[PDB]
Design a protein around this nucleic acid. Structure first.
Ligand SMILES: [Mg+2]
Lengths: 215, 225
RNA sequence: GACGCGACCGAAAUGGUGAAGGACGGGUCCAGUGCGAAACACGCACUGUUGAGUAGAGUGUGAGCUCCGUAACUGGUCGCGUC
């Protein structure tokens, strides 16, 4: 049987200066053959801890690893701003080698409501027979947010896709884009296009809308 | 001084083959184990394969065994990953990594390359259409207007977006691409700006898609009423 | 008692023989740990609680021991000869 490395939590939010612990639980003995890596967006992983508890050369001592049987932990004793990243455990006790699923450590901050903007499709795009309607949720926290599309007040389902940025390095917020895709024929059969947003920082839902063919 | 550089990634059709290389520098691969590890977009690290020193023993993940072959050419100080019978699910950034020296770092992987993107898909290379996300003819939400560019229907990844040839960076958000059911990618880049500047400041999104020889610049202005 | 001869015993040693499995070892086998630029394979070191088939998973004229012999002897005993 391949060795499973069950990593928890999948994400955590913490403040600079906090002590955090990430856990990896192996499905059979791996002795101490467990390494931990840090990975920042778009970058290669970097080794932190080897052989369960040994600090890799050049890594700051606020990183530590511990072994408790088949359960392994990475602890950061006091988070620093450069420590927000995704962390992975890996066993090298037997082939095939196995990585845990990763833990994303994100920075906690005060709740911030999104600023919401809706964009109609450009006249250029309509020429080609497709209409993309875009809704932007700007600079909000926490990441949890709900966007619903309405076409003449009918709730849409299955015809939108969302994307979210990484936490901003300055203000620690997220932004989100949601795109509703319709054929040009479908788009021209209706008037009112609306994006309705719920967020923890909003006391009530917020709707942004336009009327097709208006300013 | 230790570096690994992977190359040979790109687009391949399902069922096709592709050979990646991992050029080592600052050390000699004969004295080390070399590993391949991959990362599907938005997902975690997945171990792929490794080759042991002195014996040449090779090991593979269940998901690639029988299809992939790892090898080394010590005269080029380079390791290879030959990938056959590729499937859409093999789309990933492929990293090569050196397992370090036992006395120094156990079995940890102490150096990693930057990775090379492999896209497995029946879609053909295509440049994006770039459409304006125009600032709304109302005033704006907060105190600032939002505008942007929609970078639609390109293949494969990646594209780059900048604003005002790199001069404008504050308040810019460029979103991760989504893979549409068509098999093509789409993304948007937005920027928040003061509403009072909309008629006098210039906003240009610079879009570069190197696989398709598509580089365009779109001025984003308010519309009519 | 001395010299001498013989027999019997003892006997360093030795030819053959055949049982014993980890409490005789091993350059036997298995496992684990560390080291060699080294997860396996190769080498070294170390630790192994039925580690573990007693003559072979062995290509040891291996040690010791059993059993059958042989035996140096500058050991013992007895007989006999001379004084
Ligand atoms: Mg060995």
């Amino acid at each position: 049987s391949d060795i499973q490395m069950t990593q928890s939590p999948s994400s955590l939010s913490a403040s600079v200066g906090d002590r955090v612990t990430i856990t990896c639980r192996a499905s059979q003995s791996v002795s101490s053959a467990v390494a931990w890596y840090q990975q920042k967006p778009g970058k290669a992983p970097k080794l932190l801890i080897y052989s369960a508890s040994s600090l890799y050369s050049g890594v700051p001592s606020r990183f530590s690893g511990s072994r408790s049987g088949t359960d392994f932990t990475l602890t950061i004793s006091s988070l620093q701003p450069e420590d927000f990243a995704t962390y992975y455990c890996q066993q090298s006790y037997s082939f095939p080698n196995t990585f845990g699923q990763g833990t994303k450590v994100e920075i906690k901050r005060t709740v911030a409501a999104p600023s919401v903007f809706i964009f109609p499709p450009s006249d250029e795009q309509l020429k080609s027979g497709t209409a993309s309607v875009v809704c932007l949720l700007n600079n909000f926290y926490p990441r949890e947010a709900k966007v619903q599309w309405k076409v003449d007040n009918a709730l849409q389902s299955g015809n939108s896709q969302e994307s979210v940025t990484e936490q901003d390095s300055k203000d620690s917020t997220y932004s989100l884009s949601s795109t509703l895709t319709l054929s040009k024929a479908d788009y021209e059969k209706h008037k009112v296009y609306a994006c309705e947003v719920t967020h923890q920082g909003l006391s009530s839902p917020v709707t942004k809308s336009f009327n097709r063919g208006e300013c | 001084e230790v570096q690994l550089v992977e190359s040979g990634g790109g687009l391949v059709q399902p069922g096709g083959s592709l050979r990646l290389s991992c050029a080592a520098s600052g050390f000699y691969i004969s004295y080390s184990s070399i590993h391949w590890v991959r990362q599907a977009p938005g997902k975690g690290l997945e171990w792929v394969a490794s080759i042991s020193p002195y014996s040449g023993s090779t090991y593979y993940a269940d998901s690639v065994k029988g299809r992939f072959t790892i090898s080394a050419d010590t005269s080029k100080n380079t390791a290879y990953l030959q990938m056959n019978s590729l499937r859409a699910e093999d789309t990933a950034v492929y990293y090569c990594a050196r397992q370090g020296y036992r006395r120094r770092s156990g079995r940890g992987f102490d150096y990693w390359g930057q990775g090379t993107l492999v896209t497995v898909s029946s879609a053909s290379t295509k440049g994006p259409s770039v459409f304006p996300l125009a600032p709304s003819s109302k005033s704006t939400s907060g105190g600032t207007a939002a505008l942007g560019c929609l970078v639609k229907d390109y293949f494969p990844e990646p594209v780059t977006v900048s604003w005002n040839s790199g001069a404008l960076t504050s308040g810019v958000h460029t979103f991760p691409a989504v893979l549409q059911s068509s098999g093509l990618y789409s993304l948007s880049s937005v920027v928040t700006v003061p509403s009072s500047s909309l008629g006098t400041q210039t906003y240009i999104c610079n879009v570069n898609h190197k696989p398709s020889n598509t580089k365009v610049d779109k001025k984003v202005e308010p519309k009519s009423c």
